[PDB]
Coordinates of N, CA and C and ligand atoms in Angstrom, one line a residue:
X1 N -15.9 27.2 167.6 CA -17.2 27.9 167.4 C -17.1 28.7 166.2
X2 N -18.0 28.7 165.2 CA -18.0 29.2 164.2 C -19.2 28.9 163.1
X3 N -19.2 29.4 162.2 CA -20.3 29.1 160.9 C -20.5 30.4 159.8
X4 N -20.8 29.8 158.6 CA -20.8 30.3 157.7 C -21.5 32.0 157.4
X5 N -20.4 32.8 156.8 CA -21.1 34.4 156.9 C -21.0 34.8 155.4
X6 N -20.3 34.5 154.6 CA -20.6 34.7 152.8 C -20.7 33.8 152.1
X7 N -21.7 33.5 151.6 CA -22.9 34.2 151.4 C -23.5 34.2 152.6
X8 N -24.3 35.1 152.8 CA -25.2 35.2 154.5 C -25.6 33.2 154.6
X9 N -25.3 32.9 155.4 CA -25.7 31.6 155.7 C -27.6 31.8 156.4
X10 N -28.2 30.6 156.6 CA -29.3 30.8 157.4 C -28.8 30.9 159.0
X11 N -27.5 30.4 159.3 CA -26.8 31.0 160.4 C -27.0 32.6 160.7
X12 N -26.4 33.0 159.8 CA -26.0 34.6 159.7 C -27.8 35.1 160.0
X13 N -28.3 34.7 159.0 CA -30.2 35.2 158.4 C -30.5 35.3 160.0
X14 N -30.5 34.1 161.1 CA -31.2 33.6 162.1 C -30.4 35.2 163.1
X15 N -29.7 35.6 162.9 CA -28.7 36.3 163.9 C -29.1 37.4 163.5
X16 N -29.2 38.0 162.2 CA -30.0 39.4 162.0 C -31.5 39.6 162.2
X17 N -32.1 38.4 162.3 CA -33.8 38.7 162.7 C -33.6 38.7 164.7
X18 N -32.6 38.4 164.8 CA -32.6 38.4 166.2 C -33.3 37.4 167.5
X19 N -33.3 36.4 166.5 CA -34.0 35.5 166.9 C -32.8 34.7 167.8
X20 N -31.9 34.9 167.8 CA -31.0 33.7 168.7 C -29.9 34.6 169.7
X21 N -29.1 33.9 170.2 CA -28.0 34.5 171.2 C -26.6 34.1 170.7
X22 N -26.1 33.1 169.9 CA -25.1 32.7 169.7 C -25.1 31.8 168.3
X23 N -24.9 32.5 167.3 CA -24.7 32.2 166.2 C -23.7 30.8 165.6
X24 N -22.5 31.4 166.3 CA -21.3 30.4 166.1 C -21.5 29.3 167.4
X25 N -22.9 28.8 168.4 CA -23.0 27.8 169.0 C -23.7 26.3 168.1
X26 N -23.6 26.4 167.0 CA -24.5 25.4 165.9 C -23.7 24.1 165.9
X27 N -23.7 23.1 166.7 CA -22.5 22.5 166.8 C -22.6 20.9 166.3
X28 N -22.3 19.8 166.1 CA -22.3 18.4 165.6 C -21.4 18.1 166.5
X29 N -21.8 17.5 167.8 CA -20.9 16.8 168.6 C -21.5 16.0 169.9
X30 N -20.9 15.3 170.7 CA -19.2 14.6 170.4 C -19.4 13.8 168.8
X31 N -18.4 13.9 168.4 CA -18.3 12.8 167.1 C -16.9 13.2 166.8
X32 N -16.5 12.0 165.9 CA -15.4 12.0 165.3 C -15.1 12.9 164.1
X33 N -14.4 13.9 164.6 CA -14.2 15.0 163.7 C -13.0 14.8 162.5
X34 N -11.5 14.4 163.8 CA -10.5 13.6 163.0 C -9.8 12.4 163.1
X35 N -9.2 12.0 162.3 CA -8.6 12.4 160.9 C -9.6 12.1 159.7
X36 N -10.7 11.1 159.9 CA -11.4 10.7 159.0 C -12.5 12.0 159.1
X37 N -12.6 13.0 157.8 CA -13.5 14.0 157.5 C -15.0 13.8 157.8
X38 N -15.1 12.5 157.2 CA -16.4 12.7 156.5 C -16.8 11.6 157.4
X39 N -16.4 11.1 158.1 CA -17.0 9.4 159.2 C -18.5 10.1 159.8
X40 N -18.6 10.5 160.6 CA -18.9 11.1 161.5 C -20.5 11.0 161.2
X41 N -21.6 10.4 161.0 CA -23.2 11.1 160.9 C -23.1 12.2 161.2
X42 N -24.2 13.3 160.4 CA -24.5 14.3 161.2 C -25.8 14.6 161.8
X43 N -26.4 13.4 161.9 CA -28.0 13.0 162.7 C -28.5 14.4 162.7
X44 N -29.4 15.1 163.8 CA -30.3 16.2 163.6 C -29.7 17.9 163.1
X45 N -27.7 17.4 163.0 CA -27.6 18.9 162.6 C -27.9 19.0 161.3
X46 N -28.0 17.8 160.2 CA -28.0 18.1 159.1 C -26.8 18.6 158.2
X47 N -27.2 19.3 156.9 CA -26.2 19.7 156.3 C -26.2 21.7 156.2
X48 N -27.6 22.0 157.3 CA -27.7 23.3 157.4 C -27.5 23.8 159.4
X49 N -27.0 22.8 159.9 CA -26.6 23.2 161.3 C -28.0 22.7 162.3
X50 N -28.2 22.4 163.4 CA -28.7 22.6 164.5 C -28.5 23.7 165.8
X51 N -28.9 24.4 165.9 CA -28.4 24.9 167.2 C -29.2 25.0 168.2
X52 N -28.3 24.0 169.0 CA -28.7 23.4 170.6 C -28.8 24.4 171.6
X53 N -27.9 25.2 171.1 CA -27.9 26.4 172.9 C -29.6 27.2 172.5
X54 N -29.8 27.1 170.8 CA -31.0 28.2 170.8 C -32.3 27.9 170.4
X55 N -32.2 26.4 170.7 CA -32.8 25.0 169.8 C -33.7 26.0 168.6
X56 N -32.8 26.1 167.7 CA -33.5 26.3 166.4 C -32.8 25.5 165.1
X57 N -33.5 24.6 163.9 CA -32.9 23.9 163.3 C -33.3 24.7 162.3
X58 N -31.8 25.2 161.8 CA -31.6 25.9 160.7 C -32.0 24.8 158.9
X59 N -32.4 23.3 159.5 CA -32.6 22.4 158.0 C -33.9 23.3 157.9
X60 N -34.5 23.2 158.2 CA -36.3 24.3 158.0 C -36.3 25.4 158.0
X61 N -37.0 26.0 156.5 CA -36.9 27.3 156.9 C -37.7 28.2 157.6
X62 N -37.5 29.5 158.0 CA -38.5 30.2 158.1 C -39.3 31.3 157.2
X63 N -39.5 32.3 157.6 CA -39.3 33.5 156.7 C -38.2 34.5 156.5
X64 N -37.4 34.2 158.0 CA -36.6 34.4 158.0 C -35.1 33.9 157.1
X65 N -35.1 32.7 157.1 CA -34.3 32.0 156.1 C -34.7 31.2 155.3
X66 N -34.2 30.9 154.1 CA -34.6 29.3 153.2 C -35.5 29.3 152.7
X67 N -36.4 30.6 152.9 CA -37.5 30.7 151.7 C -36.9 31.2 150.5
X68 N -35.7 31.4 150.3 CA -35.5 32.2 149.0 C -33.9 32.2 148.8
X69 N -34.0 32.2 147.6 CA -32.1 32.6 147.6 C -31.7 34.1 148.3
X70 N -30.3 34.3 148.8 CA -30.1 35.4 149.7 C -29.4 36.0 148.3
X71 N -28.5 35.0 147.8 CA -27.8 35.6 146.4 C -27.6 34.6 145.2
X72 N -28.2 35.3 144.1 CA -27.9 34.8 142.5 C -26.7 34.9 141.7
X73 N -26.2 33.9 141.7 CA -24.6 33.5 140.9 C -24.7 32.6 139.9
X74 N -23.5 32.4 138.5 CA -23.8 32.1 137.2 C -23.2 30.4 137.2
X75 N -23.3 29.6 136.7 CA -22.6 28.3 136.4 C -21.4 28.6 136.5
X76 N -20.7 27.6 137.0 CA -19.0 27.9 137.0 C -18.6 29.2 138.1
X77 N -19.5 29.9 138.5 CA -18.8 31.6 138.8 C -18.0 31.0 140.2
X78 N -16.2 31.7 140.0 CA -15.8 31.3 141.1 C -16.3 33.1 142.2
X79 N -16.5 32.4 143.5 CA -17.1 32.9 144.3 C -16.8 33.2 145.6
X80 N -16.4 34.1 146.4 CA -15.7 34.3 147.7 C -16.9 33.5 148.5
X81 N -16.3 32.8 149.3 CA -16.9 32.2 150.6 C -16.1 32.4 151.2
X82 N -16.7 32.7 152.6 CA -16.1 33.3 154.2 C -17.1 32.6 155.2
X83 N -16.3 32.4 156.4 CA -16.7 31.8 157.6 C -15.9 32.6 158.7
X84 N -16.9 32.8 159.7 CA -16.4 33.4 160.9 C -16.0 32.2 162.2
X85 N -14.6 32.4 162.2 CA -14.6 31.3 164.0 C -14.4 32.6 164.8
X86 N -15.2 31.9 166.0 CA -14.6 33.0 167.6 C -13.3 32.9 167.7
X87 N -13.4 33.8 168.5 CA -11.9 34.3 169.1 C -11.8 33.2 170.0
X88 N -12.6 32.8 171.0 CA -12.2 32.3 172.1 C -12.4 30.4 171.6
X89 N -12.6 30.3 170.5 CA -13.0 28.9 169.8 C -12.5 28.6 168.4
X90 N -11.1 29.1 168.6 CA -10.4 28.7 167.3 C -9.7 26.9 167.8
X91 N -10.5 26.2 166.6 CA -10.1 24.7 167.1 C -9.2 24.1 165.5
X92 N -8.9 25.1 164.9 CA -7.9 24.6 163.8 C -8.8 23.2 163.0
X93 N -8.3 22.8 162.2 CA -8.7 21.6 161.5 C -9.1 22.2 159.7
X94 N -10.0 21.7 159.3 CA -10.2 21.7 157.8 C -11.9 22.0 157.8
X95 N -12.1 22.5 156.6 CA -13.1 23.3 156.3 C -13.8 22.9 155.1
X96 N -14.8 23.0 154.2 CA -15.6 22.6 153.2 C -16.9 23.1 152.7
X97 N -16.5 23.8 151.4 CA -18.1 23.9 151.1 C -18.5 22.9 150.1
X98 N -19.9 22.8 149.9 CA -20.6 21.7 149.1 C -21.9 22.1 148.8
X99 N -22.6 21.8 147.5 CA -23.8 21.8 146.9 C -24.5 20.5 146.2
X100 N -25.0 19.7 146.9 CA -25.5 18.5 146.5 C -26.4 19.1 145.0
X101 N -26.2 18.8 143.8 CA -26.5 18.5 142.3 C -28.0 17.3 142.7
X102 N -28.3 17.5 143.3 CA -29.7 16.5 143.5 C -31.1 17.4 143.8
X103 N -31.6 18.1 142.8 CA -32.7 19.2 143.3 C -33.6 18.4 144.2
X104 N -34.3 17.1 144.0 CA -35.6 16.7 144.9 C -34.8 16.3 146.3
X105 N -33.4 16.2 146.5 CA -33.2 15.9 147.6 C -33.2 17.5 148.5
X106 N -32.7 18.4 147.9 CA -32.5 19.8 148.3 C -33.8 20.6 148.7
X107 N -34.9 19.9 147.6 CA -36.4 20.4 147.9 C -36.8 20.2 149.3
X108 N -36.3 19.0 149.9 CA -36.7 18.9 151.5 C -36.4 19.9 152.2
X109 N -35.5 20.8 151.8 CA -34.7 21.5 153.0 C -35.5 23.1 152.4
X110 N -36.6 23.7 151.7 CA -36.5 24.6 151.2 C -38.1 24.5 151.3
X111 N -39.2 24.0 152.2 CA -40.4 24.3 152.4 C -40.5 24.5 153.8
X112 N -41.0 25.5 154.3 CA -41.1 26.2 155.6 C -42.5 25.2 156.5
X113 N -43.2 24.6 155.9 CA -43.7 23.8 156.4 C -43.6 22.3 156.7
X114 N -42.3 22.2 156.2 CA -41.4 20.9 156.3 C -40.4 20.5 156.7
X115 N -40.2 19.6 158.4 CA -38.9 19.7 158.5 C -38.5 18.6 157.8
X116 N -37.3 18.3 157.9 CA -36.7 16.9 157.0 C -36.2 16.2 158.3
X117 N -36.5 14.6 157.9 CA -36.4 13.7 158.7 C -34.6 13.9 159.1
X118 N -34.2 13.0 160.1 CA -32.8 12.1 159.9 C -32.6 11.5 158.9
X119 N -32.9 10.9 158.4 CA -33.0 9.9 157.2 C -32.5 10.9 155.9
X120 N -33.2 12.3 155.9 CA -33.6 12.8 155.3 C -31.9 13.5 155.1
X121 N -32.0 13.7 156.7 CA -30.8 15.0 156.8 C -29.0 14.2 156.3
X122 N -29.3 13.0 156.4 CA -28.1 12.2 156.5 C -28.0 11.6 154.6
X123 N -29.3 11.8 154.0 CA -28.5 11.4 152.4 C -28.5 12.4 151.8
X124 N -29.2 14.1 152.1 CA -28.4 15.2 151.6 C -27.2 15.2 152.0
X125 N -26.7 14.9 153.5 CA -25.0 15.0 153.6 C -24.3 14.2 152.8
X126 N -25.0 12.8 152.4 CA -24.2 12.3 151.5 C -24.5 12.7 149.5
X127 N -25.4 13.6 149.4 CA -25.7 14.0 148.2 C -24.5 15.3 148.1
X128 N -24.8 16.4 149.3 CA -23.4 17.4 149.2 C -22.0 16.6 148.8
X129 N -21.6 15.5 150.1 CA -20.0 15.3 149.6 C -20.1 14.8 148.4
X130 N -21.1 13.9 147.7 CA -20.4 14.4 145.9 C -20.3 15.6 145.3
X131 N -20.8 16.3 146.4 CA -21.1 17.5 145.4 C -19.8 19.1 146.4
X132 N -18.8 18.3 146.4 CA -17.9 19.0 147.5 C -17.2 19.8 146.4
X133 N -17.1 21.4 146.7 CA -16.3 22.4 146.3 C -15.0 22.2 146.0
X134 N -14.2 21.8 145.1 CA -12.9 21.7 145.5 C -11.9 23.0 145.7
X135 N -11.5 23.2 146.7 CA -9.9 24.1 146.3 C -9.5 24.4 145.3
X136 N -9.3 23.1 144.9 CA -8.3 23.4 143.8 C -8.9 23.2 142.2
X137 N -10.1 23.4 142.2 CA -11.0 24.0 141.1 C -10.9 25.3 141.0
X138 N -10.1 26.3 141.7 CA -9.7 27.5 141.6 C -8.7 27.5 141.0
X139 N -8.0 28.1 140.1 CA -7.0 28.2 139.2 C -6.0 29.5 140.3
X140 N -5.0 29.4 140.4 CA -4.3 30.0 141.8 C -4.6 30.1 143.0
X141 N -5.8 29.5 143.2 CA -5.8 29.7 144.8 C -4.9 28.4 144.6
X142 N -4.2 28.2 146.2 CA -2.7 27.9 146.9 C -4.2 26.6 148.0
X143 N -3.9 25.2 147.1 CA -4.3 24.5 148.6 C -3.4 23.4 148.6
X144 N -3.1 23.6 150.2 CA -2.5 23.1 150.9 C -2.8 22.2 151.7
X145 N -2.2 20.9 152.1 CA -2.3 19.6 152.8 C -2.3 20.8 154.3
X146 N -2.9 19.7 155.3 CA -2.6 20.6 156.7 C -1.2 20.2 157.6
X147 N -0.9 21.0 158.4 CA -0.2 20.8 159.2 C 0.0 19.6 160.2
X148 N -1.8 19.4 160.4 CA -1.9 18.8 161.8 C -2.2 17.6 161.2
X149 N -1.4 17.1 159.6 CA -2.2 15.6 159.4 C -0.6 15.2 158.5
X150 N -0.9 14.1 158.0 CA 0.8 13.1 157.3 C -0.3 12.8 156.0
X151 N 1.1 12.4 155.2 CA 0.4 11.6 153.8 C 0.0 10.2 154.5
X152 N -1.0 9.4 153.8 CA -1.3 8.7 154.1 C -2.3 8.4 155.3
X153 N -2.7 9.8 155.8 CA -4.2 9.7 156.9 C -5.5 10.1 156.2
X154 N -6.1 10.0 156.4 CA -7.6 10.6 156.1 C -8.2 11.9 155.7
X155 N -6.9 12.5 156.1 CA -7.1 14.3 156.2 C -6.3 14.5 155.4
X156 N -5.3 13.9 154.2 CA -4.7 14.5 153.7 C -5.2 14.8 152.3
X157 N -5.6 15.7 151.8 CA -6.8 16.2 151.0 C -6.7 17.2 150.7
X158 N -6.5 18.1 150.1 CA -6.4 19.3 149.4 C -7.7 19.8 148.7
X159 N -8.9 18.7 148.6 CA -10.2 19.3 148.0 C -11.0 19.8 148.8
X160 N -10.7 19.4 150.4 CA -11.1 21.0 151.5 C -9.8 21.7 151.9
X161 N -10.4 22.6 152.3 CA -9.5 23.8 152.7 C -8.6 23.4 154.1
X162 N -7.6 23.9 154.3 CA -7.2 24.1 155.9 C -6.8 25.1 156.5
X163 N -7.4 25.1 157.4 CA -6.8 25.8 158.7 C -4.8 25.7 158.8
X164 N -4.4 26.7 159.1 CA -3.3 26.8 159.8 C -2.9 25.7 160.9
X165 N -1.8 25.4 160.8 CA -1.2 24.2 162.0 C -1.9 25.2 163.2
X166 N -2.1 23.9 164.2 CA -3.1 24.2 165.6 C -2.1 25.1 166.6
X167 N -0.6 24.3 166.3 CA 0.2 24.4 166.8 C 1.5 25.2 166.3
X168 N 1.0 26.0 165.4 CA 1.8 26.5 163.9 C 2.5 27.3 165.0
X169 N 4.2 27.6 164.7 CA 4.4 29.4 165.4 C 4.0 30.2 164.7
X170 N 3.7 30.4 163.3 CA 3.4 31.5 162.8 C 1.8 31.7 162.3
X171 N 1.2 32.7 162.7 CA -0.2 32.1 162.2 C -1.2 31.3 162.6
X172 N -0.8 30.4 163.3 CA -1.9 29.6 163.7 C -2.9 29.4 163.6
X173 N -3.5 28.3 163.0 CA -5.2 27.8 163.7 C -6.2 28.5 162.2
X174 N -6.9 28.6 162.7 CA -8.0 29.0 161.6 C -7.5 30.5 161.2
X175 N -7.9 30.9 162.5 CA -8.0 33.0 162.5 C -6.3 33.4 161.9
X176 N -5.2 32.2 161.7 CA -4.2 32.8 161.0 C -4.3 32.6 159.3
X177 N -5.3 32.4 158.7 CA -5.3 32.2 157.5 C -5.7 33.3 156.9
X178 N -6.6 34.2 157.1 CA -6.4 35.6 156.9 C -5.6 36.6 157.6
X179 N -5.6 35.8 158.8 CA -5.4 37.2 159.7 C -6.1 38.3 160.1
X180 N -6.9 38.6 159.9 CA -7.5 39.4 159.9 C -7.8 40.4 161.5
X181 N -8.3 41.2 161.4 CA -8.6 42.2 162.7 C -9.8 41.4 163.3
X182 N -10.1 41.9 164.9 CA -11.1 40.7 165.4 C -12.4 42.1 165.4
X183 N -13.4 40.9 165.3 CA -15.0 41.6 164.8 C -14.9 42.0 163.3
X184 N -14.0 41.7 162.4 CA -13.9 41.2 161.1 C -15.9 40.4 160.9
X185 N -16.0 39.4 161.6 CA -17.4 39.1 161.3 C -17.9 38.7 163.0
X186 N -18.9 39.1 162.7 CA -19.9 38.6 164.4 C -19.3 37.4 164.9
X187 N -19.0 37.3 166.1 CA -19.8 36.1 166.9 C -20.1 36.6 168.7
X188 N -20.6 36.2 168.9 CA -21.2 36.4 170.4 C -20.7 36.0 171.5
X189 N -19.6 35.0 171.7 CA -18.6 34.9 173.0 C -17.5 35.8 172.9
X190 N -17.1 36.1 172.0 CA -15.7 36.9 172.3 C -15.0 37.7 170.6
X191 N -16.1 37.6 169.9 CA -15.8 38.5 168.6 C -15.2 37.8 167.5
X192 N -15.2 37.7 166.6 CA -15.1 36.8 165.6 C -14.0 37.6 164.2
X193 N -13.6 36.5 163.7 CA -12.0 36.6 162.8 C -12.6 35.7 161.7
X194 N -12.3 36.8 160.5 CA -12.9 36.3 158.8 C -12.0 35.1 158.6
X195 N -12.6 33.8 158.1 CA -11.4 32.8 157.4 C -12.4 32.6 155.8
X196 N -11.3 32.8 154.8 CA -11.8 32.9 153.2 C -10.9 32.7 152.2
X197 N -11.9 32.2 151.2 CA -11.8 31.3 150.5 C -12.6 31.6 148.9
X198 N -12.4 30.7 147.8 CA -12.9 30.6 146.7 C -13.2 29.6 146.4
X199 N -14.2 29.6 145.9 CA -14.7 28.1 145.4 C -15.0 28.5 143.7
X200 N -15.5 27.6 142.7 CA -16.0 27.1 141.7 C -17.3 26.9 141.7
X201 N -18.3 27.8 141.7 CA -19.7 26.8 141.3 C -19.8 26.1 140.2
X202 N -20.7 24.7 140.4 CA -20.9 24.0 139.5 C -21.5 24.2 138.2
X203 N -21.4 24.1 137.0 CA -21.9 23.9 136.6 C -22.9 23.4 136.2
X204 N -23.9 23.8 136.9 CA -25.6 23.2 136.8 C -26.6 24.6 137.2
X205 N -27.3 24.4 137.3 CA -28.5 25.2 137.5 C -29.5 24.9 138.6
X206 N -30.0 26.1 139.4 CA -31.1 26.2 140.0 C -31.9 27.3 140.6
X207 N -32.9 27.2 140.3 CA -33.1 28.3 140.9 C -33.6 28.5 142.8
X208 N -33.1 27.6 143.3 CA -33.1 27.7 144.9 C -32.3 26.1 145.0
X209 N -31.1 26.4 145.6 CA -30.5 25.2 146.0 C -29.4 26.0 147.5
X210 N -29.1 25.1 147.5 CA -27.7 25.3 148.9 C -26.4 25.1 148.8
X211 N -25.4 25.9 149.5 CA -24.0 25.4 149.7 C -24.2 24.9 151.3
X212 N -23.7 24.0 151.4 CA -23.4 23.6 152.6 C -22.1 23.7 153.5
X213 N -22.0 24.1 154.1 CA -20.6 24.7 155.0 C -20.3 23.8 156.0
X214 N -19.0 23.2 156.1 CA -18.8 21.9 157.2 C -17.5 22.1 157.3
X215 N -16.9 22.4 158.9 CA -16.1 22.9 159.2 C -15.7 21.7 160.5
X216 N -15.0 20.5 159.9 CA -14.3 19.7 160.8 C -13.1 20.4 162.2
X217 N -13.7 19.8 163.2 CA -12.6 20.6 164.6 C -11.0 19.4 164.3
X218 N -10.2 20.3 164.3 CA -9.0 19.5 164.9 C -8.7 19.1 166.6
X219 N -8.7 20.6 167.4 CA -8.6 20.3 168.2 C -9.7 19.4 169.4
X220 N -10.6 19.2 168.6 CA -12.0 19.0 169.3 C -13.0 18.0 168.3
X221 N -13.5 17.0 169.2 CA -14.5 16.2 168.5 C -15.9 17.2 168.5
X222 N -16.0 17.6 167.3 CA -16.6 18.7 167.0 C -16.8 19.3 165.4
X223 N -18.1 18.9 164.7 CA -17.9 19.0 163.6 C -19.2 20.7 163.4
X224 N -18.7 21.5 162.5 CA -19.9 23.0 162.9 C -20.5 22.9 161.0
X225 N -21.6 23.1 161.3 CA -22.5 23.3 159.8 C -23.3 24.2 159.4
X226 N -23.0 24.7 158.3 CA -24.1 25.7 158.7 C -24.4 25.7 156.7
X227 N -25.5 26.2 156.6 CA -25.5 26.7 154.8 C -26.5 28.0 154.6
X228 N -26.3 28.0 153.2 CA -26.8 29.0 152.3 C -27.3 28.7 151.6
X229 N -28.5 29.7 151.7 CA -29.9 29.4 150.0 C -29.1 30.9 149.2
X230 N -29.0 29.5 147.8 CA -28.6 30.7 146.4 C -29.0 30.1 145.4
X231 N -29.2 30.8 144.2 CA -29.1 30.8 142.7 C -28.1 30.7 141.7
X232 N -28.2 29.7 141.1 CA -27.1 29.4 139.9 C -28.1 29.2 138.8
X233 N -28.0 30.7 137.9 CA -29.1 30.3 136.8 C -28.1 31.5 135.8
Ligands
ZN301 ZN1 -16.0 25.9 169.6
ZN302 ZN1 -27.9 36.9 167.4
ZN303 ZN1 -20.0 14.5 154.7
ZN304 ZN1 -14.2 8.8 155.8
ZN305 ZN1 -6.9 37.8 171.9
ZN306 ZN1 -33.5 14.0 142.2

């Protein structure tokens, strides 16, 4: 259980209007989470989350979210992103942000009177993975193959992030990658532990587009999504 909190995600947005109960329940599942990343459709969650426990689909906006950028950032600017997992739903595995470079596909997801079909929600996910953040477009950030995968599997990839071995002694799982103190960031079953990162924005421009946040489960066929309306101008 988990979803994106820097930049405020429409996750996060949906949770400060008060509109829902469980932020980090936005879930893509059962599906094939591992070892193959990216297999999996993400039929009604899209590339901005569904959430089932509070049937609200974060692809549409409201007033509350997706009418507007939350925050304005420059071409290229590398950029802290953070995601909160629960305490009681740390499922280890690999992580990803992405900005699909395709504005009329992105324009679906950014009119409040418009939801976007399946069809719709399934070639933005494939417009984001070309358009995936790498790691190691950061000049010292440290990325690392994961624990819970071998060369030669599907997960061996260093252009998403990973989580801590599931099974790590030291550290473990997601919540050991910062470490951090718990209620570091909201969640609603049992308090929530910051996991962060830097990315590279691209080089391009917009003035309302999205990162998309897709956070593959290791221990669990379980894929969580969530994004953010921002500016690169
Ligand atoms: Zn969970
Ligand atoms: Zn809430
Ligand atoms: Zn994908
Ligand atoms: Zn694949
Ligand atoms: Zn504990
Ligand atoms: Zn286009």
């Amino acid at each position: 259980h988990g979803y994106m909190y820097i930049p405020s995600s429409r996750t996060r947005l949906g949770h400060e209007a008060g509109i829902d109960s469980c932020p980090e329940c936005a879930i893509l599942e059962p599906v094939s989470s591992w070892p193959d990343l990216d297999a999996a459709p993400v039929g009604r969650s899209g590339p901005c989350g569904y959430n089932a426990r509070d049937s609200i689909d974060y692809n549409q906006p409201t007033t509350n979210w997706g009418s507007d950028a939350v925050q304005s950032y420059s071409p290229g600017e590398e950029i802290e992103v953070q995601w909160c997992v629960d305490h009681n739903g740390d499922h280890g595995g690999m992580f990803t942000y992405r900005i699909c470079q395709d504005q009329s596909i992105v324009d679906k997801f950014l009119d409040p009177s418009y939801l976007p079909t399946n069809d719709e929600k399934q070639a933005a996910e494939d417009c984001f993975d070309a358009g995936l953040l790498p790691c190691t477009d950061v000049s010292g950030q440290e990325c690392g193959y994961s624990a819970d995968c071998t060369e030669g599997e599907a997960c061996w990839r260093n252009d998403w992030f990973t989580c801590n071995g599931f099974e790590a002694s030291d550290r473990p799982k997601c919540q050991g990658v910062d470490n951090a103190e718990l209620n570091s960031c909201y969640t609603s079953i049992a308090g929530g532990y910051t996991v962060t990162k830097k990315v590279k924005l691209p080089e391009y421009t917009s003035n309302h587009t999205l990162i998309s946040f897709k956070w593959n489960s290791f221990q669990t066929g379980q894929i969580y999504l969530s994004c953010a309306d921002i500016a690169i101008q």
